[PDB]
Amino acid sequence: TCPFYKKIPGTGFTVDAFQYGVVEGCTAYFLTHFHSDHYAGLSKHFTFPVYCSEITGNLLKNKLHVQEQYIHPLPLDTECIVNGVKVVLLDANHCPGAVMILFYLPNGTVILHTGDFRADPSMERSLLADQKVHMLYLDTTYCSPEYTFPSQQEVIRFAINTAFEAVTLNPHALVVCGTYSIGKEKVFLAIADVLGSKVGMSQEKYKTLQCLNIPEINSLITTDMCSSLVHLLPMMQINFKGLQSHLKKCGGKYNQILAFRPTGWTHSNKFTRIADVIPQTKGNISIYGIPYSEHSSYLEMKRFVQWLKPQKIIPTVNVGTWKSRSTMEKYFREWKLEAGY
Ligand code: NI
């Protein structure tokens, strides 16, 4: 059954709750972003109102075939009325089209639902600055102090420098980047830009990218593999067997592959810096795991929450075990005692 952490009290709303069938008493289903664990259950046969960003709405229509009459896109940073309740959508700094949602309850309570987010100080100057938030439904993916990671900017600088050096030393080297969802587009776009190439990909992934309102996108991507020296493949194909295979397919146009695997966190984050990363190398193939995250680090999370000073926190991630739940509740209390709310 639908868990309590997906229901917004005092409303007939649910958030990211599409795999339970009809939810008794739901008059509007919000969708924070187009990642499969969040939209799981949506299809062309859905007949209830879905509220979301413009970009998520483009993906629901073109990739899922949800019918236009059930998709209600809203602009960001704008007070809107939905079924009699004032809401605002804010940029979540996650993947394209990902939002946080502010609900203004008839009783005066204000609730923020982060969806999936990477907290940033710029959020402290959004419409969140303007009033008190009583309850926070929080993306707690990396809620433990071991989780450190570098800025997105640092990671992109590393990738750009690594690729440019390799291809300038060997003009017959191929760059490959893995993907399995939207998100992390900066990795493959930044590498292609330094190499004076478009990025080449499959027809299904090009279609996906043409939904995302990225400026000048026609100048940046293509379905013609042969013309391009940065290719995208399914993350499942980013390994030696999969890459050797792929290298054959270009027909001796390339003699070396340099591949990136954008992970979230991995335990080499605890012992190594970005300046000191190394790849796995079998022959003329090298695979780099780069810690490009679209979720808050523990310190970014903690800063956000200490700034917001909510009355109550409801975790939406790692909630399945008593041990995780208890650990999270301990950090929340530390934070509140340190900051004095
Ligand atoms: Ni996500």
Swiss-Prot record:
Ranges annotated as spanning the membrane: none
Localization per Swiss-Prot or TrEMBL: Nucleus
Tissue: Expressed in brain, heart, kidney, liver, pancreas, placenta and skeletal muscle.
Induction: During mitosis. The mRNA encoding this protein contains an internal ribosome entry site (IRES) in its 5'-UTR. This 5'-UTR generally suppresses translation while specifically promoting expression during mitosis, when cap-dependent translation may be impaired.
Variant or mutagenesis effect after changing H295A: Impaired nuclear focus formation, reduced interaction with PIAS and increased sensitivity to cisplatin
Residue pairs linked by disulfide bridges in the UniProt entry: none
Quaternary organization: Binds constitutively to TP53BP1. Binds CDC27, which is itself a component of the anaphase promoting complex (APC). Binds PIAS1.
Functional description taken from the UniProt entry: May be required for DNA interstrand cross-link repair. Also required for checkpoint mediated cell cycle arrest in early prophase in response to mitotic spindle poisons. Possesses beta-lactamase activity, catalyzing the hydrolysis of penicillin G and nitrocefin. Exhibits no activity towards other beta-lactam antibiotic classes including cephalosporins (cefotaxime) and carbapenems (imipenem).
Similarity comment text for this entry: Belongs to the DNA repair metallo-beta-lactamase (DRMBL) family.
Protein name: DNA cross-link repair 1A protein
Lineage of the species this protein comes from: Eukaryota, Metazoa, Chordata, Craniata, Vertebrata
Gene: DCLRE1A
Shown segment, full-protein numbering: 700 to 1040 of 1040
